[PDB]
Amino acid sequence: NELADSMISAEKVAHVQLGNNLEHALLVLTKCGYSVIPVLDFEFKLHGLISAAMITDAILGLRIEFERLEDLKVEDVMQTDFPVIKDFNNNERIVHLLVDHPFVCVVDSDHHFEGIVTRRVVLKQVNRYIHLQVEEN
């Protein structure tokens, strides 16, 4: 159960809500310690992922138009194309997703946001394996 036990619980992951403006999202991103955060609805279902780069790209003028952050909404710029994990029954699919994704969101069958799995657990396992090889030799 090592992949499942490594999930970071949702209440430890900052998020924004549909309808939040981009100035609010930038504040959450800056304080939270994650470079990408989930976008949830009022039922805590997962709709998207947002980063500072997505926000700033949206206000790149012909001048960075920081005044526009007040008016744009997170759903206007968030990424809607993302993988999810719905169970821990398949270790290989999770490891496969972590190749091109630094973390993957965990949701239940109705898309309620549960937490994230990151690459760190796999690095911990590789680290342990390397040390076991030293021990065995």
Place this chain on the structure above:
Amino acid sequence: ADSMISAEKVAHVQLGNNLEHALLVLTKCGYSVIPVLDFEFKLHGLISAAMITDAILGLERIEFERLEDLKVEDVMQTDFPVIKDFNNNERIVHLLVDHPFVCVVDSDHHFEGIVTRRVVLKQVNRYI
């Protein structure tokens, strides 16, 4: 060893550049953290949008007008691990447990590239 992303494929900023320029480079480049170099391409620090925005967080507002007043060296992180070569492979994997990437430099602090967690994930996927 063969997985290092070489320095010329990584965007950087230079000492003395302001935070407005750094935000532009960060936004376009596709890396969330980029190196800060000097004229000799020596590594002085690492900078991210979160470091930049934290520096201009007021008690009432995000003070974007201050981006042109601050320089990258004012906000960059200067305490980070590096590797000089691939003569200590166990240390590299050890570092990648708590760091998403580590910079590669030479003895003169010249920036050579970065090693990331992705290559390890690639190997694990292939073994599995």
